Amino acid sequence: NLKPFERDISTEIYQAGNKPCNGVAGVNCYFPLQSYGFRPTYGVGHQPY
């Protein structure tokens, strides 16, 4: 868990299972950093603030 008033920049591959990947990713290994779906069609709550 993140501490209050702490900024984390290092984004490594996150192991989501027993399967050791070490840069393999795939199943049970998903990279934490993920982008928004910025659609103008998207309504209130999915538009930028």
Next chain:
Amino acid sequence: VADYSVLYNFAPFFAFKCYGVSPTKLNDLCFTNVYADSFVIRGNEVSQI
């Protein structure tokens, strides 16, 4: 006693996708009821469902 430790042992090959809940750490989770669904589907169609 829902033990998912064996889950990574028997059939970890193709996919371990978990939707709506944490893919791991559910072994310690306590909950009411569990439903099991079994079917044979094409490999490419696993993302469709």
